[PDB]
């Protein structure tokens, strides 16, 4: 029941011949899995943890300059020279300055000069890389028991593809996942600030134009391309002075717009990404399947409520005899002839007489009837639901398109049953995503919108080429409008 | 000789006394007495309930 109330909630229907189904888990999302004569389970990825990160490169933010020295070089007698340039802690640069008799030199002309000042960094960031074998995925498992540590927590590691979770009264669920098919961590990097952290690309991280050392260093003083953080100024070509630039942490924050917020102050914790998983529901069984239904009177304790997905939830208390027993619950039309709505809290059972049980399902569009109990004493609160079948279909297509756009090829496996057309979609969408990523790498959403408009205009005034161009233009316009950045 | 301060631009800031107020759906957005207190920066978002 933990998935109830989440806006990003999806349902998967049916099982394969092997009683398995392919599902994808997301941080902040939850998927409800139901099947014929099978218990309904909620899957939600709640924790992503990384163990033993390796420091790769530290970029500096706070720097101070001391021991500034300049030496007075005359023209045509070569460049000047200082003792401190022997050590790379001193940033130095050669410029050209005026010299003359007023400067106590025998000839008039443009003379050399060098300024050297020690580079001392005060505050720096850390870039850590975790191997994919150290990933830790935590998934919570909760069935629709109807009870008001109720769920089951499991640990997913690359060390064990198959993880077994025992459910009290529901049998044991066989859980199969691929931790390394989601976020590509060996290509990834974890950036650390003073107290914040970001999950950002490794290559862009190496492309940061800031002083840095490789993570293996222990001295922490041999910074590289220190010129990017200092500046030499020649106001009148009389001499140069070196001054350190300001704090780049604000500039870094303005540079991490598209990065994802992750917390690793106390252990590397991640709350983003996706996980493709193969669900095996072979050994699951309905809790309380071997129980007759309740023939006593039923009482509703919480008023019926509607979720954002059109489903309904109700809490009922039992006061007859025969506990534990099944609740006879079903959906009728206004005609009392057809059954229209079907349960998603399949096989509701009351465990204790005085303990209320939450029954949660979905009604049909328009008006219907909610039936609890049996003659005599069936509860009669009918319904009212806003919406339409066409609206539901278009909204479902919008959700599917958004999921495909934000996942990639793995979205075809979100509810795949191993069909041949599913594999065809795998291959084609994977290759088209390959070209799309190779073509649209590093551009903002406005760039995608502009290119889409251009391609649409090219297509509309061009033929199979014209329709292909307008199709790719409209799909990339959708991608640009639906992407955050 | 005579400089006049036009305006002061803040470049480092610190935030304390963080507050949060929530409302059930279809009851508008919550309000706090620091919302008028313009020393307190405020923003309204939407949260699953």
């Amino acid at each position, epitope marked *: 029941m933990r998935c109830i109330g989440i806006s990003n909630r999806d349902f998967v229907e049916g099982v394969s011949g092997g009683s398995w189904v392919d599902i994808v888990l997301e941080h902040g999302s939850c998927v409800t899995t139901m099947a014929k004569n099978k218990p309904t389970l909620d899957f939600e990825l*709640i924790k992503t943890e990384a163990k033993q990160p390796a420091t790769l490169r530290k970029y500096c933010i706070e720097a101070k300059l001391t021991n500034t020295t300049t030496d007075s070089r005359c023209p045509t007698q070569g460049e000047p020279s200082l003792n401190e340039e022997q050590d790379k802690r001193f940033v130095c640069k050669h410029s050209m300055v005026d010299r003359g008799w007023g400067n106590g030199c025998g000839l008039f002309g443009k003379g050399g000069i060098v300024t050297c000042a020690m580079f001392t960094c005060k505050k720096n960031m850390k870039g850590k890389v975790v191997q994919p074998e150290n990933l830790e995925y935590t998934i919570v498992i909760t069935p629709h028991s109807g009870e*008001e540590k109720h769920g089951k927590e499991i640990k997913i590691t690359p060390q064990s593809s198959i993880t077994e979770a025992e459910l009290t009264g529901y049998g044991t669920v066989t859980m199969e996942c691929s931790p390394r098919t989601g976020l590509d961590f060996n290509e990834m990097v974890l950036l650390q600030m003073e107290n914040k952290a970001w999950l950002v690309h490794r290559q862009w991280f190496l492309d940061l134009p800031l002083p840095w050392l490789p993570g293996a260093d222990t001295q922490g003083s041999n910074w590289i391309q220190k010129e990017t953080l200092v500046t030499f100024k020649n106001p009148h070509a009389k001499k140069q002075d070196v001054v350190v630039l300001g704090s780049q942490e604000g500039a870094m924050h303005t540079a991490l717009t598209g990065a994802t917020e992750i917390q690793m102050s*106390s252990g590397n914790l991640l709350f983003t990404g996706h996980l493709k998983c193969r669900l095996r529901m072979d050994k699951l069984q309905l809790k309380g399947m071997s129980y007759s239904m309740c023939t006593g009177k039923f009482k509703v*304790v919480k008023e019926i409520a509607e979720t954002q997905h059109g489903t309904i939830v109700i809490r009922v208390q039992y006061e007859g005899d025969g506990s534990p027993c099944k609740i006879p619950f079903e959906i009728m039309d206004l005609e009392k002839r057809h059954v229209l709505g079907r349960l998603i809290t399949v096989n509701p059972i009351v465990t204790e007489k*005085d303990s*209320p049980v939450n029954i949660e399902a979905e009604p049909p569009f328009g008006d219907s009837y909610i039936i609890i109990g049996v003659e005599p004493g069936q509860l009669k609160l009918n319904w009212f639901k806003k919406g339409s079948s066409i609206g539901q279909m278009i909204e479902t297509t919008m959700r599917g398109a958004k999921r495909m756009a934000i996942l990639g090829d793995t979205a075809w496996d979100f509810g795949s049953l191993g069909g041949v057309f599913t594999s065809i979609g795998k291959a084609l969408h994977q290759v088209f995503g390959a070209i799309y990523g190779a073509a649209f790498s590093g551009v903002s959403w406005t760039m995608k919108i502009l290119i889409g408009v251009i391609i649409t205009w090219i297509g509309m005034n061009s033929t199979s080429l014209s329709v292909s161009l307008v199709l790719v233009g409209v799909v990339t316009l959708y991608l640009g409008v639906m992407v955050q950045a | 000789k005579q400089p006049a301060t036009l305006r002061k631009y803040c470049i480092e800031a610190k935030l304390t006394n963080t*507050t*949060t*107020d929530s409302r059930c759906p279809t009851q508008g957005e919550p309000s*706090l007495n620091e919302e008028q207190d313009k020393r307190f920066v405020c923003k309204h978002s939407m949260v699953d309930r």
Partner: antibody
Amino acid sequence: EVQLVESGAEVKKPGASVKVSCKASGYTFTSYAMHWVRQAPGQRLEWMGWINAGNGNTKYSQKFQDRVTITRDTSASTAYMELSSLRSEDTAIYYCARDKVDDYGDYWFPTLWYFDYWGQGTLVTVS
Amino acid sequence: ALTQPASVSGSPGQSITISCTGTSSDVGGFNYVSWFQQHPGKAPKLMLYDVTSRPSGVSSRFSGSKSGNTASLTISGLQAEDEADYYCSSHTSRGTWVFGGGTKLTVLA
């Protein structure tokens, strides 16, 4: 099973500082939030505040914002706190309570069954 | 704060109702309403959270209900051991917790 152990009673002059602690045993201390509720003799219950044992966030009541500081100790599974600027009315019995944090380790929304267990109580006397 | 009667007394084996009234920000706004018993010299214990529901290990005689801005706790079949202090607690939308004024339950001899 679940047991909470509090420190012994202390008597101090008004205006001083008193430090007490509550130990959590029989359950995961990190995945639970520690609350503190005091009750003066013959008075009502008051919510002093709470501390998160997962990350360290602390929230205090307005009446004790500048007088109560709460710390933690993950290794010993015990929470430390100190109350300063004592007054005569501060004489009360303090109870520590537990509450499950969310799956993300935060305490934005308490669970339905919060305050399921309470400590034995520690008396602070001001004279 | 939460306002509740100072003391409520009733005959043993009878049904009595105790009401806790707050504001729309704590009691009427959210369902985080709980009740506790304060024995003399003993720590408080929880017997009812989310008034529509009950905790484990608690007899079903205690029943809770909410009427808008007022939360009501109903006990059927009063007994001698019920004589103790009672408190009502609610969690407001500001993130703080409020408690009632304390009510002592008396059972007629």
